[PDB]
């Protein structure tokens, strides 16, 4: 979370892992995810998702949704013509928002830009859409 970056709490991860594993909490998976990822960077979100052992098929299915949303973002957000001014980094691509091709420092730069480029919140939306599919299926 941005608060300066601060590591995600150990027991935020706890909450999460223990909310994924237990079926009685299935309806609260999405709300729990939302509550446990407040101010999260994409790196934080990936760390949280990837901390879960024993749900590989579900996690692969989520990644497919994420990758689809990343490509849809790119379709509707063509990159701006450079050259980039000094001190300025690119507008984020879909893979940047998902944290695959961006660094923590780039993510922080976007999220604390004035006005904010809220890459954490955007990614969170994609993950939630994916979690809907997996709550439905798995």
């Amino acid at each position: 979370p941005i608060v300066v970056h601060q590591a995600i709490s150990p027991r935020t991860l706890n909450a999460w892992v223990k909310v994924v594993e237990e079926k009685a909490f299935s309806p609260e998976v999405i709300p729990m995810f939302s509550a446990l990822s407040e101010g999260a960077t994409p790196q934080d979100l990936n760390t949280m998702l990837n901390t879960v052992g024993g749900h590989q098929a579900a996690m692969q299915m989520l990644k497919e949704t994420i990758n689809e949303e990343a490509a849809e973002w790119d379709r509707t957000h063509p990159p701006a013509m450079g050259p980039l001014p000094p001190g300025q980094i690119r507008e984020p691509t879909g893979s940047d928002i998902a944290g695959t091709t961006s660094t923590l420092q780039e993510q922080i730069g976007w999220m604390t830009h004035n006005p904010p480029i809220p890459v954490g919140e955007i990614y969170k939306r994609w993950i939630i859409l994916g979690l809907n599919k997996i709550v439905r299926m798995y």
Binding site: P78, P79, A80, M81, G82, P83, P85, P86
Partner: protein
């Protein structure tokens, strides 16, 4: 081997001055040729009457979007590959290709008004100002940190010398 081209620049339709460029055909022939042919209008379209739509003081003056925001077209199709990155952005006067990422060259270009080393390996340098750098310097004052210009800066005429 290396052709020379000129722009006659105008500010709100009033003549400002001539800027000439040496194009580095010897090192980036494909990129040189695109800019050369767009300058003469010999394909039936090109830079004549286009504007410098993005000027950032202390950085660069950008133009060559003669189709209207990512617009313009090369003489080879809409986009072409980065030819090489042999030449560097060493100082004011450097003429280099604008792009929206790797291998996305079209018609847009920029003139450096400072040393811009962080663009090395990302934008293809293909020429330099020969005469008229003081005109480029004057053009800078019409820009903003935004890039938005305060006046219509246009290429009233252009061609090969």
């Amino acid at each position: 081997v290396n052709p020379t081209v000129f722009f006659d620049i105008a500010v709100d339709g009033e003549p400002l001055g001539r800027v000439s460029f040496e194009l580095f055909a010897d090192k980036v022939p494909k990129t040189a040729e695109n800019f050369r042919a767009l300058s003469t209008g010999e394909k039936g379209f090109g830079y004549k009457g286009s504007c410098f739509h993005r000027i950032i003081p202390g950085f660069m003056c950008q133009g060559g979007n003669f189709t209207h925001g990512t617009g313009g077209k090369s003489i080879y199709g809409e986009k072409f590959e980065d030819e090489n990155f042999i030449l560097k952005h060493t100082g004011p006067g450097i003429l280099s290709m604008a792009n929206a990422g790797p291998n996305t060259n079209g018609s847009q270009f920029f003139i450096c008004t400072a040393k811009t080393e962080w663009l090395d390996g990302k934008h293809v340098v293909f020429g330099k100002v020969k005469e008229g750098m003081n005109i480029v310097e004057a053009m800078e004052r019409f820009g903003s940190r935004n890039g938005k210009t305060s006046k219509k800066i246009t290429i009233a005429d252009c061609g090969q010398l």
